[PDB]
Design a protein around this ligand. Structure first.
Ligand SMILES: [K+]
Ligand SMILES: [K+]
Ligand SMILES: [K+]
Ligand SMILES: [K+]
Ligand SMILES: [K+]
Ligand SMILES: [K+]
Ligand SMILES: [K+]
Ligand SMILES: [Mg+2]
Ligand SMILES: [Mg+2]
Ligand SMILES: [Mg+2]
Ligand SMILES: [Mg+2]
Ligand SMILES: [Mg+2]
Ligand SMILES: [Mg+2]
Ligand SMILES: [Mg+2]
Ligand SMILES: [Mg+2]
Ligand SMILES: [Mg+2]
Ligand SMILES: [Mg+2]
Ligand SMILES: [Mg+2]
Ligand SMILES: [Mg+2]
Ligand SMILES: [Mg+2]
Ligand SMILES: [Mg+2]
Ligand SMILES: [Mg+2]
Ligand SMILES: [Mg+2]
Ligand SMILES: [Mg+2]
Ligand SMILES: [Mg+2]
Ligand SMILES: [Mg+2]
Ligand SMILES: [Mg+2]
Ligand SMILES: [Mg+2]
Ligand SMILES: [Mg+2]
Ligand SMILES: [Mg+2]
Ligand SMILES: [Mg+2]
Ligand SMILES: [Mg+2]
Ligand SMILES: [Mg+2]
Ligand SMILES: [Mg+2]
Ligand SMILES: [Mg+2]
Ligand SMILES: [Mg+2]
Ligand SMILES: [Mg+2]
Ligand SMILES: [Mg+2]
Ligand SMILES: [Mg+2]
Ligand SMILES: [Mg+2]
Ligand SMILES: [Mg+2]
Ligand SMILES: [Mg+2]
Ligand SMILES: [Mg+2]
Ligand SMILES: [Mg+2]
Ligand SMILES: [Mg+2]
Ligand SMILES: [Mg+2]
Ligand SMILES: [Mg+2]
Ligand SMILES: [Mg+2]
Ligand SMILES: [Mg+2]
Ligand SMILES: [Mg+2]
Lengths: 34, 158, 52, 130, 44, 71, 110
RNA sequence: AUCAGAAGUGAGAAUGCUGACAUGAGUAACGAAAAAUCCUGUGAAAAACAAGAUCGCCUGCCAGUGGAAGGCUUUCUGCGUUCAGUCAAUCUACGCAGAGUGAAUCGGUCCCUAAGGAAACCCCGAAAGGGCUGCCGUCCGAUGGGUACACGAAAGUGACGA
RNA sequence: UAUUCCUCAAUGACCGAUAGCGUACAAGUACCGUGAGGGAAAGGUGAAAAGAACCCUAUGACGGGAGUGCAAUAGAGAACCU
RNA sequence: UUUUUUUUUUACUGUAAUUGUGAAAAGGUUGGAAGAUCUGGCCAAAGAAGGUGAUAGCCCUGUAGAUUCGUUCCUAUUUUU
RNA sequence: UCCAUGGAUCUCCGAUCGGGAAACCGUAUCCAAGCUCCGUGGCUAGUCUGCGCUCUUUGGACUUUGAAAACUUAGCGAACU
């Protein structure tokens, strides 16, 4: 049976990484109660 | 009016239940115990210190009048009391023989003893219910076993 | 049916119950070959050799 | 197995939210809310198989979600589907169940503002729509 | 008097719709220009 | 639950706010086929079948009890 | 009192009285000990409970009344997620190709 | 401070730009020759609101019934008067909250084509593209023709003006 | 050798809410146009909300006292430093 | 087949340890509150920066570094028709 | 709670299976191979063989390349002044 036989970052990835860092920077400050 | 670009404190050397001394403010020079830590404002509440007077209007549910509760202090306004000499001291990090993190007294003039982690932390804020509810499975039924891959117990309807 | 459903322990225990019920003369080579064909078609080779 | 049918569902997840009827006795139909991608045959078969209803007919209609617009800012709720199910035999709802009595008592607060003949029926079938 | 805007939804979609703009080379440049500007309503 | 949308999402054409021959639909699965006379024929093999086992006498419950028993 | 007389009485909480207490949800380690029949029966029990809770929330909100204990709904919802994850985990571990491809359809089918 | 350095360096006027505030002025006006009057009630306040009585206006293109095009919750019930209404409004197409639209036959979807549009093949053209829809030929397009299987056609037809 | 739809770090005799990007604030938004297209406005209580319990006069406190606070013309509901 | 293990040592924008560790004393006066002023000790391969009730090197988070982890190498990825 | 790594689920348009008023509609692709279950036909009747589909595995048949600012190389190429 032929089953039991043994056998750089893209621009969207850089954009997702930058977006996550942008959220993480906003979440680093003291929240203003309101 | 929170105009300052103040960052959060990520790792707290101040724990709920610790014994501190207020070093700055209206109640400077007075000792107490930490009741609650407000992390999102970098503030703490000392038990019975830094009081304020609130004018609360009472409706059909809550009672009115002028109450008196504690107001938060900044987390850099308190300082942990050395357990030996009783004077406030700084907190450093020491590794034990296992490799367990502890808090040790730091500062010239201090004993360098271990700041004990308070015992109030292990006690639950919301205690467990005494009695089960009418839609709760008793623990003798959950722990029984009906699936076993080696003997093929409980296989589907294939 | 239990061998097609891959309930090997219950099928073995049903074999033993049919033995103790006085019907064991019915297991000729044909029905054991049928059980082996079922188990090999559902890929249970260790239990197939146990049944063997 | 797979020879039984082309569409066989073992784990249904159709959400059904019942609407409280006006009367407590002699209920001939009831209404419910569900997701917009449900079909009359799906609702009838789920209600028959899961709960044990005796369904006669199912009538549906679509609704838009509630919206609020304040000049540029828009907030909204999800769209839903409303279904009317007609029963073969009348059913009833007890008063002692929460929150039936509160619903009736709050409903009656908003709405504050003999000659029987021979062969006259008492409990007649009250079904609306087409 | 009879004003100039007399509405008709099918005419609006047949002149300024997404697949009406996508059909010719000028409308494809219109769609690219709108997306580059950042409009919320790319098509009519 | 109220959630935020864009105000430009009101411009997307819906059959509630369209001329009388506009048809969109709500992604329901089909159950048959259209006829040449404007009708419909429901093919019974495409209807869903539900396999709901008998739940009477079941001992498990929606929640798990949280009484203090042991560490 | 304690048992519904109609299918219509199953959209109501008949045992609600004295604060009523509800437990936590099922964990995956506790679900990994159960058979397929018990897991299917538990799925349908949780489905009926979820229908009751959503009906109760809608009925109470329709008269400007608060929904008591809203945390019951996510417990049921995440328990129902864990059941499907456990069944798919078994369907991966099934060694026969046809049986695994049929168990995945039995789980994910709709 | 002093002594030096770099300049987006000094306002009264460009029928200059933006904002704020005056004058005319408590002046014109309160928008179709149908029209109002009174008892009671609610309210802090009633010519304008609720209910009732008396009078008038519209009846084949301002005024009645159903609904196409467009609008998109303006519909109904409770609460309210900050905004809007040519009001000092208790009322409302106004704000808050909830509810409401049920189809084998109605109107669509579906089938078929017109005017028209587009692909394929072929023809032409610095590029982009333009033509061609048939001799064998495809997909859309109602303002029209159809309402209880599928396949085929050298059969009839559907089929029409003033 | 050319450029920056992009990433990381650093600098400024660069600007400081009619300035600096059109956008310090949920902006290519609201709004205008059939369409291509044009295109805004709007920053700040106080260290901490301790954001004024209670009394009097009005239909109604945003008023006059009382109280919190260093300070109350520092008393606001996309707006209260001078 | 698996597990334990001899396994060299530097470089690194590896802008690695999101946020790991990381030094440094007490008094007096004014002030709503001390970082201010007076007396007086200490750290610096750390006096870049931002907070805390006014202007803080020693109150807080960090910073220089030092330890830990991981890419090359030592330690050749070889053998078979 | 949180973090690192690996997993399970993973709606639709843009868009590419066909149609299209973008976010909708209709869709079991086709043909060889070998395997459990299924039903039916035929023999001299016992480890007898021969016909099918549904769904599963492995191949091969048709096609779906595809975006993007400036830079680069080419084609055509103004007018105000
Ligand atoms: K001027
Ligand atoms: K209409
Ligand atoms: K002041
Ligand atoms: K470091
Ligand atoms: K401090
Ligand atoms: K400092
Ligand atoms: K010239
Ligand atoms: Mg602050
Ligand atoms: Mg309908
Ligand atoms: Mg969204
Ligand atoms: Mg409509
Ligand atoms: Mg769809
Ligand atoms: Mg699913
Ligand atoms: Mg100048
Ligand atoms: Mg000037
Ligand atoms: Mg002038
Ligand atoms: Mg001017
Ligand atoms: Mg006058
Ligand atoms: Mg005059
Ligand atoms: Mg006049
Ligand atoms: Mg009157
Ligand atoms: Mg009236
Ligand atoms: Mg007349
Ligand atoms: Mg006319
Ligand atoms: Mg409205
Ligand atoms: Mg109305
Ligand atoms: Mg008014
Ligand atoms: Mg008034
Ligand atoms: Mg009203
Ligand atoms: Mg209204
Ligand atoms: Mg019809
Ligand atoms: Mg034609
Ligand atoms: Mg053409
Ligand atoms: Mg062409
Ligand atoms: Mg086409
Ligand atoms: Mg056609
Ligand atoms: Mg027509
Ligand atoms: Mg005709
Ligand atoms: Mg500006
Ligand atoms: Mg200014
Ligand atoms: Mg301004
Ligand atoms: Mg527009
Ligand atoms: Mg007040
Ligand atoms: Mg100030
Ligand atoms: Mg670090
Ligand atoms: Mg330090
Ligand atoms: Mg600093
Ligand atoms: Mg100051
Ligand atoms: Mg497509
Ligand atoms: Mg390119």
């Amino acid at each position: 049976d032929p089953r039991f036989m043994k056998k750089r970052e893209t621009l969207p990835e850089k954009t997702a990484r930058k977006k996550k860092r942008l959220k993480q920077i906003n979440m680093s400050f003291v929240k203003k109660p309101h | 009016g929170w105009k300052a670009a103040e960052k959060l404190i990520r790792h707290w050397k101040i724990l709920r239940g610790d014994n501190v001394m207020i070093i700055r403010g209206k109640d400077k020079g007075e000792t107490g115990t930490v009741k609650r830590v407000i992390r999102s404002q970098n503030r703490v509440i000392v038990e019975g210190k830094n009081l304020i007077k609130k004018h609360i209007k009472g409706g059909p549910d809550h009672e009115g009048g002028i109450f008196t509760v504690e107001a938060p202090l900044h987390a850099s306004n308190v300082q942990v009391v050395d357990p030996v000499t009783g004077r406030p001291c700084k907190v450093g990090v020491k590794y034990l023989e296992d490799g367990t993190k502890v808090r040790v007294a730091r500062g010239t003039g201090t004993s360098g003893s271990i700041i004990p982690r308070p015992e109030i932390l292990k006690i639950r804020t919301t205690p467990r219910p005494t009695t089960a509810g009418p839609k709760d499975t008793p623990m003798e039924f959950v722990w029984e076993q009906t699936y076993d891959a080696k003997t093929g117990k409980g296989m589907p309807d294939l | 049916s239990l061998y097609q459903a891959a309930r090997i322990g219950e099928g073995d225990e049903m074999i033993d119950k049919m033995k103790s019920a006085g019907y064991g003369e019915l297991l000729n080579k044909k029905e054991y070959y049928g059980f082996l064909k079922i188990l090999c078609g559902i890929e249970r080779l260790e239990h197939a050799m146990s049944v063997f | 197995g797979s020879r039984l049918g082309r569409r066989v569902v073992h784990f249904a997840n159709l959400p059904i939210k019942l609407l409280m009827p006006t009367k407590l006795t002699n209920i001939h139909e009831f209404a419910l809310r569900t997701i917009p991608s449900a079909t009359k045959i799906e609702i009838k078969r789920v209600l028959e198989s899961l709960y044990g209803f005796e369904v006669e007919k199912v009538n549906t209609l679509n609704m838009d979600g509630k919206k609020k617009k304040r000049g540029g800012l828009l907030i909204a709720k999800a769209d839903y589907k409303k279904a009317y199910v007609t029963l073969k035999n009348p059913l009833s709802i007890s008063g002692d169940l929460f929150p039936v009595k509160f619903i009736e008592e709050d409903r009656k607060s908003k709405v504050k503002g003999k000659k029987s003949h021979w062969l006259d029926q008492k409990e007649r079938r009250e079904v609306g729509g087409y | 008097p009879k004003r100039t805007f007399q509405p008709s939804t099918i005419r609006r979609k047949r002149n300024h719709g997404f697949f009406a703009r996508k059909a010719t080379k000028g409308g494809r440049r219109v769609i690219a220009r709108r997306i580059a500007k950042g409009r919320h309503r790319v098509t009519a | 639950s109220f959630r935020r949308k864009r105000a430009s999402s009101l411009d997307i054409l819906s059959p509630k706010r369209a001329p009388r021959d506009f048809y969109k639909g709500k992604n329901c699965k089909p159950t048959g086929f259209h006829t040449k006379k404007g009708g419909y024929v429901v093919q019974p093999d495409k209807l869903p079948n539900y396999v709901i086992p008998d739940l009477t006498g079941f001992k498990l419950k929606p929640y798990v009890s949280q009484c203090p028993i042991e560490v | 009192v304690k048992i519904a007389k109609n299918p219509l009485e199953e959209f109501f909480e008949f045992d609600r009285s004295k604060p009523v207490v509800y437990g936590r949800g099922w964990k995956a380690s506790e679900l990994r000990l159960k058979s397929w029949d018990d897991l299917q029966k538990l799925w349908y029990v949780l489905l009926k409970e979820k229908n009751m809770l959503m009906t109760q929330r809608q009925m109470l909100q329709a008269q400007n009344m608060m929904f008591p204990n809203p945390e019951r709904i996510p417990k049921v919802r995440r328990s129902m997620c864990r059941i499907k994850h456990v069944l798919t985990e078994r369907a991966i571990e099934e060694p026969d190709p046809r049986r695994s491809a049929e168990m995945k359809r039995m789980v994910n089918g709709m």
